[PDB]
């Protein structure tokens, strides 16, 4: 028992003992030009560690400057910490791949002794929240609201066997890579999605196309205006003064709700009495929703689709505008079409910011240009688009759980990696024992029991 | 006492001041001057109060610029002479009128006014009273900036009620303002001695000339304050102009002020006005409020007592703020802290408290260290009704606190944690050191005590002690006792409840306590596992 | 309330902190300068807004590392005051250390 | 510069815009109210900060949809002035439409 | 002309004013008063200027409060009488001194001053000149707030130089301030007529009493302005106190002002001071600057010309802003717009311009509509050297603009787009309607013209015309002509370059133009595909 439950094999050693050198850095005389002028050697500020891994340097610091200054040259593959800036006393960490670099007073270069301690191991170790708690024990303190290098040295950290430290570190490293990997795919998918948006809508699946009033389009497709296909409805708000309207149970969706996103429900709701007297327009499910006010980025459009099971339906305010399909149409397809940027440009070109602005006139919407694909094709396009969106959501969720997994795993491994057992492999004549999912676990259990029994021979085995 | 026919009549005159260049903040000041001169004439002995050549007729008879210029010279001539009696009332006094047609319209307007609010005999008192009330409306108005020196009447009453000033006790106010605390302290003393009639002439003289002392930086305000005491029969010391002295509490004047048995004050918030700290304190600071605290600790006689209205900063400020707070709890016996609501001040986005403490201890009036032991805090802020002109802050809101406080002015009356007013039981409990190892019932009390060692350790010597969320949400209140005890635990336990509700919906279980208990029995236990 | 009022507060605090700890070198001034700001940053809403309205301080940060990534606008403004204070106090560091050293003579 | 100065500017503009288009109903006031704000919002840095320091306006938004998701602090403050103007002008809408209608009589 | 020994000597005296309660903004005002009284005595005929009982000896001999009060009465007594000559100089004048020991220290201080800056004969002119220069330092200082009425000297000179005021022409300034533009306009006229000696006595009288007119809202400033003209031999009209009249340009005084042939002014920025718009305009507004514009359009005689310093808002403000801008281009012939740099004003985060236009047109002085046809804009803001006390804004920065402008005061001199000063060629070109269909060379010019129909259509009648980024980056400047022509195209073309560099690195190609061209030949073409 010590900082935390610690295993037999390990010892809690101070960082100072384990570390070859712990020292601060200083600040150069800014006034002198010569120090900065024409500088070869990168100079780093506190911001550098905070932003990403340390590949890049915001400022530049000359060697003349280096000579006249406490600042020294740090080695590559070295851990770095930022004294200032934190929740009164955390400290930031980073690794420097690029050639030996220098820093200022806030940064503290730290070097691990060879084979004594790994840089990778330490970096994760400091990163751990447990690390944060340890420092917080000091408190904000008076006049020293930072992490004193002296205090840093005192720190007690457990020390694993050299072999295990590499293995443990590697495992964490892979996990970090994985999150990065998923992130990369994640970024790419909306880029791809964006491409489909333009191509699918205009191009459609066909191959034979002709010239059209609205850009090049498929031959099969036909052209019509919004008014032809859909009907536009305008809307008014209830008087705030009457509380009768206020008691509710029926949704009324304002632009703000639209900002939220897909809308089954709304923050404020309006009563049936209100609908009848006011003669508000009720909307059935699967209807299209649009934003009439606060413009957006000026004259532009916003959209949303109402959700309902046979349980509910939605009504909205003046700020919003509704569209109802006469028939042959797929609402999801149209919704995506509106939000498309192509629509944004066309609307903007037709109407520039004018007195009527930050809003769309009914005439404008009706006159709007739109393609009319066949019913089946529309469904196919819509299904594809919607599915892609779902995929993006799923990946996000996957990332979240993975992150959680790391947290859980880190907790266990910190203790377990710390046991000597981790260095040693489980006793097994054949590798097959581990291979089976269940078998591996069984082997582990047997080894543990046997080892403990052998340990029983001397108390010291367990005790140490 | 409320504004009446007289207040409305005084208001109409301010229309001339408004359209004369005068601000809403100086209305009363402008009116008081003119009214005084007018009243001296009505008295029929102006010859005894004002100097020849500078009386009501000399001003009232003139017109236009000839009048504004004469008025100026008159304001200066009166505020400078050996007849310090009247001089006190016009010292550093000047008009802010610029429109010559407006002054002519004003003087003649009130010249034809009544004793409308009057009474048997001249009701000079009434004019002053109305004057104060009108001033309050201004003090209350945002645009004016007057709000700086405004303190909820019910707060003043309460503060003096808990200090219980006795005759022969010197009551000081470092930030007198319009002398609100002093007037109230005097009123309280008179209400316990038949207006001084229960006391021998000598003690009466003490109460009239030495019992109350104030200090105000802004000469304009000090003037109003001087008129206030004067009509309240508080003469103070003629050497300094009266009960309220003119000067800087953080300057030479501050240390030249006489010690005191009692101190009730509401020093300025923010960085204050033009007040340079040209005085050395036990712990030099930049903050103006922490300087006042050091002054208040200094002037108090051994065994003295005080009630000081302060901002949250004083409680949680670091650097030198910690040193001064440790100094306070060393040299004084801080026993009670009242955390006030929000929106009770003409300001708005501020947080204020009232510290109650004794200089040294009742047993050892001269103790230099470890005077503070247990500090009682009363949360009258979190989860409180949004105060405003709609929701007024009254004496009713302070009665619970004054009850638990005790009847002893040194806060030595027996006390026991436990006060759940203003829906304290329905307020969200915070998960912090304060509520550590605290049972469900206490963690929701607005009245709790904290030890010196605890404040030292847990709070690192910070008096920004808080322990209720008073979340504004409606949730069923069904929980295990252990769940309630651990505030932090609630999140985990509550999470289990969320899933339970979903299952219950499918079940269609009725809304009954028994049903909830049955489900909780299994679900609750599972979490424990 | 003005920026010069807040600056005149931290400047006086740093002077005090310098004496209390006999500070003689700029390389030992970091913590005194940063505590000085803490004590001088305004606490009220309007005071913070009034300071941002006055002479001597712009909205941009010099080092973005001292800028919190947060949706709370008032914290961003407070952090900018804090940063400008620390910058301006560092420009007076040598002058202040010389005035302290020079205040006595045999 | 104060919030009341900006508010007294949009209030007067809306009065003008009401006359120019013979507006008689609140349901036709939206665009006039929003243009009024556009004309009264300050354009200088300090003026925007001075307005935020004065009486009559807080930092929190009523509808977060009118708040831009942006790192530019000055745009967030301008958007908050714009929002408060529109809210306060809507509270005076009926009064202003009545004063216009009532200014002539046979 | 620079501050000298005299300016340093005047500065030392302000130390008394500083420690006397006087602000840095009123230093000059306080000094001017005293100096004037002192000079009248030194003249040896004070009996002709000042009234008995109120002369230098009457003030100088007194001491303490007896002196401050006498001084007050004296300030009022002088500013009110039929001897309007002197009255003009002390009208609405008042001291801001409060410390009685400070005034005594001031009066005696300068009483023993020299004609240190003097010359043959009394150099009254010198004191006034030094006075103005000192005022400039204050006008320049931020803390003071005086900066509101400060305009870069080189800007004033330039503005008057391009307007070329001739004798018999009435030059007006709606926002006189300290009469900076008028004094300069008068200086220019004198420099072209041997100080009026080339003109007949009657025309000389015109230049002395009717040629220049100003209007200032703040009486304090108007006083300083009045003293300025007076020592510059600009008497103006005695009925109004002199060349600068006291009043509101947006009020009754504004429309009571006489028409003018020329108008050079720098109206107030922001929401302005206490200036209520109690005057009806062709397009009622709330904005103060757009009101001034309406006034300026109104007072100008047919064929009149003006140069008005305005904020960016005026150019891009909607609502009534568009209506007033259309009114300006209808009733006036706006021909030139100068977009000023930043940091040249005591303020800082502001954007200013200078509009040059004629009332009607030279050919048809009474034209009511379609007066504006082509508008020339000179970008002297984007990609400019950060001005400050380190990087001063001089006349050198304005010479290029004044060259292309032409020598004709109506902007009718032949003009041709094309001016690439201050590294215009290295400035980033913006992709907007302004640069649409514009060749590489022109899109980087600081001097460009835009048609009325274009402003109407593309700009929707907005004069906030801008077309350079002047990005601060160092990039090789190798591009195809067509690439440069399309600003937007650059991003796409540049993207190709990024990849090319990477390949080049592997190749190890030398840094030569030929090598770049060879690569570009293939890479550039590929993008086109």
UniProtKB/Swiss-Prot annotation, chain A:
Gene Ontology biological-process annotations: DNA restriction-modification system
GO cellular component assignments: type I site-specific deoxyribonuclease complex
Pfam family, one: Methylase_S
Induction / repression: Encoded in the hsd locus, in the order hsdR-hsdM-hsdS. There is a promoter upstream of hsdR and another between hsdR and hsdM. This probably allows expression of the methylase enzyme before the restriction-specific subunit.
InterPro entries listed in its UniProt record: Restrct_endonuc_typeI_TRD, Restrct_endonuc_typeI_TRD_sf, Type-I_RE_S_subunit
KW DNA-binding (keyword) present: yes
GO molecular function, one term: DNA binding
Alphabetized UniProt keyword annotations: DNA-binding, Restriction system
Subunit field text: The type I restriction/modification system is composed of three polypeptides R, M and S. The restriction enzyme has stoichiometry R(2)M(2)S(1). The methyltransferase is composed of M(2)S(1).
Its biological purpose: The specificity (S) subunit of a type I restriction enzyme; this subunit dictates DNA sequence specificity. In the presence of the R subunit the complex can also act as an endonuclease, binding to the same target sequence but cutting the DNA some distance from this site. Whether the DNA is cut or modified depends on the methylation state of the target sequence. When the target site is unmodified, the DNA is cut.
Family: Belongs to the type-I restriction system S methylase family.
Entry remark concerning the domains of this protein: Contains two DNA recognition domains, each specifying recognition of one of the two defined components of the target sequence.
Note: Type I restriction and modification enzymes are complex, multifunctional systems which require ATP, S-adenosyl methionine and Mg(2+) as cofactors and, in addition to their endonucleolytic and methylase activities, are potent DNA-dependent ATPases.
Protein name: Type I restriction enzyme EcoKI specificity subunit
Taxonomic lineage from the root: Bacteria, Pseudomonadati, Pseudomonadota, Gammaproteobacteria, Enterobacterales
Gene this protein is translated from: hsdS
UniProtKB/Swiss-Prot annotation, chains B, E:
Cross-referenced PROSITE patterns: N6_MTASE (PS00092)
Cystine crosslinks: none
Catalytic activity: a 2'-deoxyadenosine in DNA + S-adenosyl-L-methionine = an N(6)-methyl-2'-deoxyadenosine in DNA + S-adenosyl-L-homocysteine + H(+)
Residues noted as binding S-adenosyl-L-methionine in the record, renumbered to the chain: 148-153, 178-180, 216
EC number(s) on file: 2.1.1.72
GO molecular function ontology, one term from the record: N-methyltransferase activity
Record keyword Methyltransferase present: yes
CC per GO annotation: cytosol; type I site-specific deoxyribonuclease complex
Broad class of enzyme this protein falls into: transferase
Keywords of this entry: DNA-binding, Host-virus interaction, Methyltransferase, Restriction system, S-adenosyl-L-methionine, Transferase
Induction comment: Encoded in the hsd locus, in the order hsdR-hsdM-hsdS. There is a promoter upstream of hsdR and another between hsdR and hsdM. This probably allows expression of the methylase enzyme before the restriction-specific subunit.
Residue stretches in coiled coil: none
Keyword Magnesium: no
Superkingdom per UniProt: Bacteria
Alphabetical list of SUPFAM superfamilies matching this protein: S-adenosyl-L-methionine-dependent methyltransferases (SSF53335)
GO biological process, one term: methylation
Subunit structure comment from the entry: The type I restriction/modification system is composed of three polypeptides R, M and S. The restriction enzyme has stoichiometry R(2)M(2)S(1). The methyltransferase is composed of M(2)S(1). (Microbial infection) Interacts with Escherichia phage T7 protein Ocr; this interaction leads to the inhibition of the methyltransferase restriction enzyme M.EcoKI composed of M(2)S(1).
Note: Type I restriction and modification enzymes are complex, multifunctional systems which require ATP, S-adenosyl methionine and Mg(2+) as cofactors and, in addition to their endonucleolytic and methylase activities, are potent DNA-dependent ATPases.
Family label: Belongs to the N(4)/N(6)-methyltransferase family.
Protein name: Type I restriction enzyme EcoKI methylase subunit
Origin organism lineage: Bacteria, Pseudomonadati, Pseudomonadota, Gammaproteobacteria, Enterobacterales
Gene: hsdM
Swiss-Prot record, chains C, D:
This protein's UniProt keywords: Early protein, Host-virus interaction, Inhibition of host innate immune response by virus, Restriction-modification system evasion by virus, Viral immunoevasion
Listed Gene3D superfamilies: DNA mimic ocr
InterPro entries: B-form_Ocr, Ocr
Keyword Transport tagged: no
Entry's Gene Ontology BP terms: symbiont-mediated evasion of host restriction-modification system; symbiont-mediated suppression of host innate immune response
Top-level lineage group: Viruses
Function: Prevents both degradation and modification of T7 DNA by the host restriction-modification complex. Structural mimic of the phosphate backbone of B-form DNA that binds to and completely occupies the DNA-binding sites of all known families of the complex type I DNA restriction enzymes. Thereby, inhibits the restriction endonuclease activity and protects the phage genome as it penetrates into host cytoplasm. Inhibits host transcription by binding to the bacterial RNAP and competing with sigma factors. Inhibits the host exclusion defense system BREX.
Protein name (database record): Protein Ocr
